[model samples]
Target: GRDINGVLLLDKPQGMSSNDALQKVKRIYNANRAGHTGALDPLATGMLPICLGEATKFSQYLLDSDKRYRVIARLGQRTDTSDADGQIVEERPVTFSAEQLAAALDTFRGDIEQIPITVYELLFIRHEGNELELEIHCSKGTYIRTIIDDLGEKLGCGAHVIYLRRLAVSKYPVERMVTLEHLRELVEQAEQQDIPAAELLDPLLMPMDSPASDYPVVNLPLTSSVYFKNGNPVRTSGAPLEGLVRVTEGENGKFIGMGEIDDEGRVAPRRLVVEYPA
Candidate 1:
């Protein structure tokens, strides 16, 4: 196993569990350590960010960030798991009009206290026959299955998630995600060329600090970075008085890890990256 450090944007395939996907990717990269930011149901497919090596420490940030998803809810059927994987528990006739569905969706928009889920943007919605397609952008912990189940009750027709795909996570671009088949192909091609497949695949992994790219950055001088790296709070000028910040060092701005401002206005190490020998 190698000490590879970066984030792999995996397009998780259906029917495979999140851990299964993580294991496959870890083996592909032959990384010493790796982990996924969050779990995607076995039936759902899409972006599953895998943090390798030192990148694993920053996975929590990606897990807590907002997510966007595209889901297809099938009308007239309700499943035990609120998704296609579970057995059908109930069924009803599809009777809601497009306008009626639109009205129902309006109630779900914005902040709502009904189900502990906030719909930042319904984004897109289409109703055709007994199928409903929706693209939703929402905060973390939102369950599309629950939303569909609740919509079923509102429309007087049972519903369940027939299809679900994550469109984005935090600031990650959807285009960057790679499929398992694509990764395998890259490895095969590299082997044929008599080159290390890891070399070819390494470029696909995003920087370990990318997940924390949105946070404010605190550039610590070598003097303070030494203490910061040792898990000690270090005083630094021009740092934000509050909130999480990305810790970097030197003129090249090498990212170290993540930190937060303390009550005394000093940078306190929260999670630091470690380089493991290969």
Candidate 2:
């Protein structure tokens, strides 16, 4: 079978988990390796980064990228899950005017504290596709439903999440996503769909490389890669740091290891961005 490597963007259906989606792609491509960045809730739909081949090493970086959500929060109801899927503890109609809604949204701008919803915690360790729910733009742990609840509290009106669509994940946008139906269609129509390299490339699939972003990034020297093992970070020139980075530099281009940086500024041990033999 022909093989390819890079990244694929998925407009995940509401019923599937991130890992579930990854498995489907893996089965179809029969690729050596694949992984996804930032897991989304099963009930949500939007861009999911399917890092094929060697990109899996850096999936962790995108997990914390600021994600954009278009959410519809129904007024005057409280749910144990803070979303429509959970049990309703109370129900009532909100009488807030449009002005009140705008004001409420304004209150959430800028840096602030937020908590993960009970719904996410309920799924994180279940071995489900979305077991590792992402809290994008979150402090590695904040949750969106919790933010919505806090908004409800400040506005003196109860609320629950009714609908949610992930519009953006870091630089990855939903507009670039290929629906499963469309993907299948494209495959069947390959004679007409054999796109040129430029047209086929979706830049959103690229790994994030922002230096100041709170999420850790791996950086390596310009020459040796004996430092990397498939799943572990190797010791290097710098002192080891927590939430560390993995990187490599050789005749090959510089790439991140989706790991952390060390105190000595070295992009220490991590998995490889391109795991193939160099």
Candidate 3:
């Protein structure tokens, strides 16, 4: 089989768990290894990215990135599960007009404190099975069921996540997503070895190091690599490139790893980067 690592932007259909969707695609490619960056609710549909082959190493970067969702928060009447999948617990009138709804969304933008829901409080997606709420941002894990409960409490109308759809994830957007039928065509061609599998994916993957780009680059010498990799601070010359920095060096400035800056302007290794398989 073709061995290439890249990201797959799939428009996951309704029903089934994320792992379920991943298994289907994995079987089609006969891929040896793969992983979905973030889990999407079975009821939700939208851009769900799958990292194939060695690209799985970069999954962490995608994990922390913000996601955009065009979720349907069914106002009034919450379910035991906090979504349409569960029993209806209560009901009330949805007073917010479309305009009002839009305005409410505005308040959600920017940094916010989100709570986790019971159905998936563990992942911080949504919590409060019967009654719960939270506020989170792109960097924060989200469970829409939790958001629904939070909003319902404020509205004084207990709510459940009637419907949810993930429109965007970190680098990929729902706009670039292709339906399963489209992927089927790719598979048909792949069977004939007519299309390059890597070509089937988006040209550029949101680089894993991009999230920590806000930090500086701290290069370590080969001698210091041993100490640094083992968790010793390789003292820097000059200002010590405070905050998080992508550790790299040599002729190509190969991304070697990551380090963080102390409040004292000191640097410490965070995560080590990997060179693509030769």
Candidate 4:
């Protein structure tokens, strides 16, 4: 029921669905509203950015951003879901050497069309017998499972994900991720000290505008900000001629929302944050 506004970088644990993780985080923060940037499969674990309260408005941007992952693929077996959780559909011999695997991986690097993904960097970590570890930086909607499956096909074998972990999302750093254990400990500590749990945990949240922090900023004075907030396009000088910008207000740089520079050079509100009365 708290109007907490920020992004909590949750290190989602394995076997938990994304929605389940979001629910747990919402319960932990006791937030009025919360949403996760994207869904990570129940078997996959890593940065699941939970946007709380007003932060939910900018969550789509984070979803649209690129992702980085470290995945381990088990060759010689293919599964229905392409991950360890799936039923084994086929099995084959792992006869491909490191050189052959490297050549197969090269085809996936850079811009490649997948009816199903663009992989940016597909760095081969290591290949030990039937297991292969890889680090990949890729665009949105790129399916890591598909990559491993395709690689298996190319290697004259079959493959499925054994271990998968999302390392980063967009501009969010891996270091910022907090585990479920850490959050539980914070809550326990607060209770033991007879203090509000939020007092200890709320500070862990990143500012709501962090999702759009890289966008060009457009600072509007109180007068024009009111107009912009009202869904009226307001003329602003420093904004780019034609791109989305992060809108802020006054000398304090209080984040209001996001805006796009209209064809008329006016800052048109795209999404604005609603300030709830305390």
- The segments of candidate 2 whose C-alpha lies over 4 angstroms from its true place after superposition are 1-3, 97-99, 116-140, 191-278
- In model 2, how large is the Cα lDDT of residue 90? 74
Candidate 2 local lDDT, 157-243, one digit each (tens): 677777777766665545667776765554455536675332433343443332113443343444334545344334545434555
Which model, 2 or 4, shows the larger lDDT? 4
User: Which residue pairs clash within candidate 2?
Assistant: 234-269, 244-259, 244-260, 245-259, 245-260
Candidate 4 minimal-lDDT segment of 10 residues:
269-278
Q: Give each model's whole-structure lDDT.
A: 0.88, 0.57, 0.61, 0.90
Error of 1 at 42 (Å): 0.4
* Per-residue lDDT over 119-153 for candidate 1, one digit per residue giving the tens place of the 0 to 100 score: 88996477887899999888888877888888898
Clashes of each: 0, 5, 19, 0
Say which candidate scores most in lDDT.
4
lDDT of 3 by residue, 234-272 (tens): 776642545666676555655556777766565566776
Model 4 Cα displacement at 182 (Å)?
Answer: 0.6
TM-score of candidate 2 to 2 decimals: 0.64
Q: List the candidate 3 regions with Cα displacement exceeding 4 Å.
A: 95-137, 190-241, 245-278
Q: Please tell me which predicted candidate would have the highest TM-score against the true structure.
A: 4
Candidate 2 weakest ten by summed lDDT: 123-132
Measured with C-alpha atoms, the lDDT of residue 91 in candidate 2 is 67
Better of 1 and 2 by TM-score: 1
